[PDB]
Design a protein around this ligand. Structure first.
Ligand SMILES: CCCCCCCCCCCCCCCCCC(=O)OC[C@H](COP(=O)([O-])OCC[N+](C)(C)C)OC(=O)CCCCCCCCCCCCCCCCC
Ligand SMILES: CCCCCCCCCCCCCCCCCC(=O)OC[C@H](COP(=O)([O-])OCC[N+](C)(C)C)OC(=O)CCCCCCCCCCCCCCCCC
Ligand SMILES: CCCCCCCCCCCCCCCCCC(=O)OC[C@H](COP(=O)(O)OCCN)OC(=O)CCCCCCCCCCCCCCCCC
Ligand SMILES: NC(=O)C1=CN([C@@H]2O[C@H](COP(=O)(O)OP(=O)(O)OC[C@H]3O[C@@H](n4cnc5c(N)ncnc54)[C@H](OP(=O)(O)O)[C@@H]3O)[C@@H](O)[C@H]2O)C=CC1
Ligand code: SF4
Ligand code: SF4
Ligand code: SF4
Ligand SMILES: [Zn+2]
Lengths: 178, 114, 146, 155, 95, 47, 342, 206
């Protein structure tokens, strides 16, 4: 199936009624007036703009933004230093050098994202078998400097010690889809 | 060893092809300094042309000299035209990186570089 | 499990003795200058070296050729080996002249009063491999060890 | 009094520079698509006095969207060195901040900051058009808190 | 358990405090040091021991899909307690 | 969050901070690593 | 030294040099090159600014991601010098404006800034206090700055001994105050230079020669007190030094000689400018005190640099001052100056 | 079978039949026509015979392949002629694609098909820029994608992932100039390559 878009030319011996119809399109250029009334149809509409800091537009629970390290309901940093979250991070952004915690437990001494890296792809929150690293719904965390985007572990736990009321609602809204 | 040549035969025919190229830079260094504003006088601009030809003299294979000419015709087509910049042509000089000491003794007052 | 050792009590900077008598930290420009001063000064037979343990077969030469250019042979090592007859000569008096694989192709082993188990532990394993498989008999000479 | 007059002049001098700042018709990558959605009828620049003028001489801020390659880099500082010098800079993306993808490639500069100095950094691979908008509202107060006549009086 | 070093900086989960003779303490000048006050070494210790009835039992983190792949412990030791490597939750056998 | 409020977990913050941009009370990176090497201890005993 | 002041790194731009340094006057002309020659090789460079955050943007580059950290201060307080030089191995002094401000005079700037620093720097425990006086400033000079820039050269030695003191000549470079001074005399009828230029022998020096000299002075085991003098070759004469400029800058050149009876008073007319003045009482007189012969001092060549002649790097600093129809003129052209040995 | 992409046996005979056709019509410069499980055809040739089997495939009633799609150059540095140079073509008339690949050294060029397929004016230039395979009889060979002073042929596997130079602005000379490469993270080559063939009897017997 194919459809011609510009193919109508056939000289039908244009009658004098179909001439003025064409000779008044020209000499009154009215096809354009059908455009001026078309833009006049929109100043009388409601402009879709929104007062940003007072009206921040709509998102969804899977909007992935600023990373954060979640935490079990009884402290206990939810990371267990697997290293299958830098083995997949394609931007090569994460370095999670670890040790035994001196409790005998197994936790990070090091964790890192270079947020000037971190394509914000979601591979690390879907790979984490424990739901430690997530990618929160922040999108206002711009910075005046380059060093404030090198979130190591203390800027990134306490970040997860901030949005956990707001993360878990979205994680609870989505653990059926994943 | 019964290999296929390109743009030449035994080396003596592939050095006029090199001199025809030196025959194009030496007349077009004074042109570039005029066109695009450069600090160079003319002589440290031309001496660099010889410096970058008196780097690959150790070659003894026609096909290789047939090939290095071509890349020079690129970078002359890119310089007789202003597709390059002050930046790109004043990149040959290596003015920034400090020339590391060739001598043994100072070469490991910094770095494990054999 | 000794890789913990390469990150502990390990020398980093070139130190040098102080006007008080303590060790300070300085640069290669200052230490080699002091060492070289005490090598252009004393020469020949009062200038010597004691290697030992964990040493290349490359620094042994450079440390040999350096001290031979000030005509010294006092190049010594920590653990004694004889010299009374053909000590350093004739490379059959300080080697496994048999292959270490050769322990398989053998019916007898006299072990002088040493532990292959704890001196070169894995020369004892070929002995155990050749203790089990091919019927070998051993005679250890001195110091009963388990 | 003189200081109080100068603080208010320096608070009044900036109201113009921060309200009517005219960014520059940059591009280079996906990130630039979100600037269009910040010119769109949802998050309007023009409501913030922010207007695309496609020449630096008419400009007041560079918005660097996209991978700043090594071939584009002379054309990026040939352009930053064509404005007047109340000039500001904004680095949209993780390709422009550090080179997020392509940090280890050979034809990519590992940050807009290698070349032009920057006032603010907007992260996000495609930062939401409401995330440059948070930045060029933050750049819009980063020079509300500049004191250019105060430090002339005490000098 | 953020406890200050004799220099003045704070200690993290891990002792990492820059020494007094270190040059990389400038970066906190006119600034400060983001350090989490809630050490998981202690909060997990501030948590009782589930004195369960069975010898082999299960741990999760409150939701099978919401964390902690389901591993099982052997509670034969009465002296020590059995723990999951994922959380730090302790258990006992009661008999 | 008046009729569907969240669950509190005795670590979550109570006093939320805005984007600390260029003031103090901002972020500065570390090397949270425990220094991974140990050099030597010269004695205070000459010979 | 410690474990991270170690220079374990090749070259620079991501390496270490153990040159954690304070450089106070890094908002102007010389310090922007010093930071460049420290940051390029890999070095933390503490840059205290008293000024606009907008004027320190060009210092945000020439820094490899953590080695450039800034902080605020003012000369008229304590506890803002005892924070910069705390975590340092090196300190560098580049302060000095060119004139008297309403609040900081020649003595408040060339004597009391190094004194407070160098004392506040000796207490911290740093090893080096590279200081920059100005050559021709012994004492009893015709000016008022150089009569005070030797006072600082003594009030530092009496405070922080074993300090390096560089005494450079009159410096030139892009956005300088030396060649771009005489270049802008063309806005008037002509150049009013004294005695038809003669009786003023000058050997200027390029910035990077000074900066590469400083950066290598903060690393040698030498220079534990050695004074210096960064002067450069080609000891020019002023009339021919300016004729070179206005042949390079092809506008025109005619003298208009004067005594100091008036040419030091015209500076007092332009000295009545609340902004950066075009001339002063004393900016006229440095040009005319400028007379020296090198006697014994170490200099550049025994510090790491082979200095640069003005014959070569003069395009870059005067190519702007030209008109179209001279905007490309090839220093092949333009008749190099006459150099005097004496 | 519900997850295994049915083989569709019909269009594997159509192409293999056309494979013998292209070989016996043209024994010169042709070796091992092959056709994969994926129903697509491969006709490897000697590099002296490129144009005689691109004009043929552009100008022939039963092999109308007048539209070029790609011209790659695969690097395999375990053979003399490392640069395999792959053409792939398309019949509007037959709705069939094909692959016509060749070989080359670091110095054994291949004549250009710009007369046959003008589309390869730039696909050849990038192969020169990326790999360094010269092309006889080509209007304006030169770079497209790399810088104007980029010494190197980057897609050569000999070339490092981050190159030898990187650029930055030098206030002392007021230009974006190069000093050699100096990383901050050192790209961590991971050893993700398992044992365990995964494809037995689809392997290399010694
Ligand atoms: C009150 C607000 C005013 C609204 C007027 C703006 C135009 C919108 C009207 C709707 C529309 O688009 O009609 C399209 C229609 C177009 O419909 P069409 O394009 O689908 O077909 C036209 C009919 N044929 C093809 C047969 C010719 O416009 C017309 O048909 C008639 C108007 C065209 C002529 C008007 C322009 C020329 C007149 C200039 C003389 C001065 C006029 C008076 C100006 C007063 C100021 C001095
Ligand atoms: C006529 C020209 C006068 C221009 C200045 C008038 C004040 C402008 C204004 O309303 O905002 C000023 C601003 C307030 O506006 P604003 O620009 O800071 O922020 C507006 C708030 N949002 C973005 C949320 C909508 O007030 C000041 O702090 C400026 C003080 C200096 C002005 C001179 C005071 C004497
Ligand atoms: C009784 C006996 C005596 C009577 C004697 C009098 C006899 C009658 C005279 C009739 C005159 C008819 C009107 C004359 C003007 C017509 C001009 C004209 O013909 O324009 C034609 C031109 C198109 O030309 P062309 O190149 O051929 O394009 C078609 C190609 N397919 O068209 C164009 O290209 C113009 C397009 C420009 C559009 C710009 C938009 C204009 C915005 C409109 C403002 C609206 C308000 C109007 C205000 C008016 C001023 C008060
Ligand atoms: N460049 C030249 O022509 C020559 C200079 N010298 C010497 O070299 C050194 C460099 O001076 P240069 O940098 O060239 O001159 P600048 O004009 O560049 O001034 C340098 C810095 O000094 C700072 N400064 C001056 N006075 C004060 C003050 N009272 N309180 C705080 N900061 C102050 C300024 O800070 P802000 O930017 O905030 O004003 C400026 O950044 C000086 O010792 C000078 O005498 C010697 C020979 C030639
Ligand atoms: S995958 Fe999750 S638990 Fe494992 S190291 Fe990464 S963040 Fe920690
Ligand atoms: S979101 Fe993607 S790019 Fe970002 S840290 Fe996670 S895995 Fe890496
Ligand atoms: S950061 Fe992401 S969206 Fe922006 S240019 Fe790079 S790949 Fe495109
Ligand atoms: Zn558990």
């Amino acid at each position: 199936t194919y459809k011609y878009v510009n193919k109508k030319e056939q000289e039908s011996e244009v009658d004098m009624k179909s001439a003025t119809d064409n000779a008044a399109r020209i000499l009154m250029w009215t096809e354009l007036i059908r455009g001026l009334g078309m833009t006049l149809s929109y100043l009388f509409r409601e402009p879709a703009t929104i007062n940003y800091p007072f009206e921040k537009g709509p998102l969804s629970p899977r909007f992935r933004g600023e990373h954060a390290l979640r935490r079990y309901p009884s402290g206990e940093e939810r990371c267990i230093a697997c290293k299958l979250c830098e083995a997949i991070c394609p931007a090569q952004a994460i370095t999670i050098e670890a040790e035994p915690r001196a409790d005998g437990s197994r936790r990070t001494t090091r964790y890192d994202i270079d947020m000037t890296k971190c394509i914000y792809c979601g591979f690390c929150q879907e790979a984490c078998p424990v739901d430690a690293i997530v990618e929160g719904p922040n999108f206002e965390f711009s910075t005046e400097t380059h060093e404030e985007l090198l979130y190591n572990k203390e800027k990134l736990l306490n970040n997860g010690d901030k949005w956990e009321a707001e993360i878990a609602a979205n994680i609870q809204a989505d653990y059926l889809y994943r | 060893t019964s290999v296929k040549p390109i743009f030449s035969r035994d080396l003596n025919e592939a050095k006029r092809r090199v001199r025809e190229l030196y025959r194009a830079w030496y007349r077009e260094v004074p042109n570039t300094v005029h066109l695009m504003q450069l600090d160079i006088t003319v002589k440290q601009g031309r001496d660099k042309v010889r410096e970058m030809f008196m780097k690959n003299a150790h070659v003894t294979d026609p096909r290789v000299v047939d090939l290095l000419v071509i890349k020079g015709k690129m970078e002359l087509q890119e310089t007789i035209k202003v597709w390059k910049q002050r930046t790109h042509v004043m990149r040959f000089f290596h003015e920034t990186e400090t020339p590391r000491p060739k001598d043994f003794l100072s070469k490991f007052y910094m770095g494990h570089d054999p | 499990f000794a890789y913990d050792g390469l990150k502990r009590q390990r020398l980093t900077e070139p130190m040098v003795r102080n006007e008080k008598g303590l060790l300070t930290y300085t640069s290669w420009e200052d230490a080699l200058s002091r060492v070289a001063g005490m090598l252009q000064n004393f020469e020949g037979n009062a200038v010597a070296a004691i290697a030992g343990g964990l040493v290349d077969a490359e620094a042994l030469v450079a440390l040999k050729d350096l001290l031979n250019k000030v005509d010294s042979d006092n190049l010594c090592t920590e653990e004694i080996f004889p010299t009374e007859g053909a000590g350093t000569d004739l490379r059959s008096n300080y080697l496994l002249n048999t292959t270490i694989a050769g322990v398989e192709e053998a019916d007898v082993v006299l072990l002088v009063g040493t532990n292959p188990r704890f001196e070169a532990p894995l020369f004892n394993a070929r002995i155990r491999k050749s203790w089990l498989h091919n019927d070998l008999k051993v005679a250890l000479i001195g110091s009963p060890v388990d | 009094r003189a200081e109080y007059v100068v603080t208010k002049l320096d608070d009044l001098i900036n109201w113009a520079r921060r309200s009517s700042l005219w960014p520059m018709t940059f591009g280079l990558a996906c990130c630039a698509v979100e600037m269009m959605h910040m010119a769109a009828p949802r998050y309007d620049m023009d409501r913030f006095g922010v207007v695309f003028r496609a020449s630096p001489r008419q400009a007041d801020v560079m918005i660097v969207a996209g991978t700043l390659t090594n071939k584009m880099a002379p054309a990026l500082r040939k352009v930053y060195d064509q404005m007047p010098e109340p000039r500001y800079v904004v680095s949209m993306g993780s390709c422009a901040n550090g080179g997020g993808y392509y940090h280890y490639s050979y034809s990519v500069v590992r940050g807009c900051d290698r070349i032009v100095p920057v006032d603010i950094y907007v992260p996000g691979c495609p930062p939401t058009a409401e995330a440059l908008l948070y930045g060029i509202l933050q750049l819009q107060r980063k020079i509300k808190r500049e004191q250019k006549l105060k430090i002339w009086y005490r000098r | 358990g953020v406890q200050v070093s004799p220099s003045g900086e704070k200690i993290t989960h891990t002792g990492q405090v820059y020494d007094e003779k270190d040059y990389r303490r400038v970066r906190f000048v006119d600034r400060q040091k983001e350090v989490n006050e809630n050490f998981a070494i202690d909060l997990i210790a501030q948590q009782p021991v589930n004195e369960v009835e069975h010898r082999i039992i299960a741990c999760d983190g409150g939701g099978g899909a919401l964390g902690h792949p389901k591993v099982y412990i052997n509670l034969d030791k009465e002296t020590k307690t059995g723990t999951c490597g994922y959380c730090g939750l302790q258990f006992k056998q009661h008999h | 969050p008046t009729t569907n409020p969240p669950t509190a977990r005795k670590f979550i913050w109570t006093n939320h901070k805005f984007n600390v941009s260029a003031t103090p009370e901002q972020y500065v990176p570390y090397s949270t690593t425990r220094k991974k090497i140990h050099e030597w201890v010269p004695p205070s005993t000459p010979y | 030294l410690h474990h991270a002041v170690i220079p374990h790194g090749k070259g620079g731009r991501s390496s270490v040099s153990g040159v954690v340094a304070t450089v106070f006057g890094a908002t102007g002309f010389l310090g922007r090159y010093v930071v460049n020659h420290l940051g390029r090789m890999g070095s933390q460079v503490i840059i205290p600014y008293r000024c606009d955050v907008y004027d320190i943007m060009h210092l945000r580059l020439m820094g490899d991601l953590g080695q450039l950290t800034f902080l605020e201060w003012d000369a008229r307080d304590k506890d803002s010098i005892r924070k910069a030089v705390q975590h340092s191995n090196v300190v560098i002094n580049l302060i000095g404006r060119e004139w008297e401000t309403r609040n900081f005079d020649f003595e408040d700037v060339f004597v009391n800034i190094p004194r407070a620093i160098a004392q506040a720097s000796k207490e911290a425990g740093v090893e080096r206090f590279i200081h920059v006086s100005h050559l021709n400033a012994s004492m009893k000079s015709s000016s008022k700055s150089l009569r005070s820039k030797a006072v600082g050269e003594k009030e530092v030695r009496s405070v922080f001994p074993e300090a390096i003191i560089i005494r450079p000549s009159d410096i030139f470079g892009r956005e300088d105050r030396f060649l771009n001074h005489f270049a802008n005399y063309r806005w008037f009828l002509a150049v009013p230079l004294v005695s038809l230029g003669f009786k003023t022998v000058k050997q200027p020096v390029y910035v990077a020669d000074v900066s590469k000299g400083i950066v290598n002075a903060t690393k040698d085991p030498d220079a534990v007190g050695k004074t210096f003098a960064f002067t450069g070759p080609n000891r020019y004469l002023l009339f021919h030094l300016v004729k070179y400029i206005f042949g390079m800058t092809h506008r025109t050149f005619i003298p208009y000689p004067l005594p100091l009876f008036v040419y030091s008073w015209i500076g007092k007319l332009f000295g009545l400018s609340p902004f950066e003045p075009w001339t002063t009482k004393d900016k006229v007189e440095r040009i005319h005190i400028s007379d020296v012969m090198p006697t014994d001092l170490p200099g550049l060549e025994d510090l790491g640099v082979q200095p640069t002649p003005l014959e070569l790097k003069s395009i870059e600093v005067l190519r702007r001052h030209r008109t179209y129809r001279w905007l490309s003129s090839e220093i092949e052209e333009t008749k190099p100056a006459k150099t005097v040995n004496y | 079978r519900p997850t295994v992409r049915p083989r569709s046996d019909v269009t594997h005979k159509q192409l293999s039949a056309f494979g013998e056709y292209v070989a016996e019509i043209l024994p010169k410069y042709v070796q091992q026509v092959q056709v994969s499980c994926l129903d697509e055809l491969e006709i490897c040739i000697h590099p002296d015979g490129v144009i005689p089997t691109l004009t043929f495939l552009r100008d022939h009633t039963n092999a109308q392949f007048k539209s070029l799609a790609d011209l790659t150059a695969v690097d395999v540095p375990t053979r003399q002629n490392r640069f395999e140079i792959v053409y792939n073509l398309l019949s509007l008339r037959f709705n069939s694609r094909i692959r016509v690949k060749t070989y080359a050294d670091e110095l054994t060029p291949i004549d250009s098909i710009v007369s046959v397929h003008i589309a390869a004016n730039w696909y050849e230039r990038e192969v020169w820029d990326m790999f360094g395979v010269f092309f006889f009889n080509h209007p304006d060979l030169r770079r497209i994608l790399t810088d104007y002073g980029f010494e190197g042929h980057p897609f050569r596997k000999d070339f490092p992932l981050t190159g030898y130079v990187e650029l930055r602005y030098d206030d002392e000379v007021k230009r974006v100039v190069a000093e050699p490469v100096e990383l901050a993270q050192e790209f961590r080559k991971f050893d993700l390559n398992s044992p365990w063939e995964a494809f037995p009897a689809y392997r290399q017997p010694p």
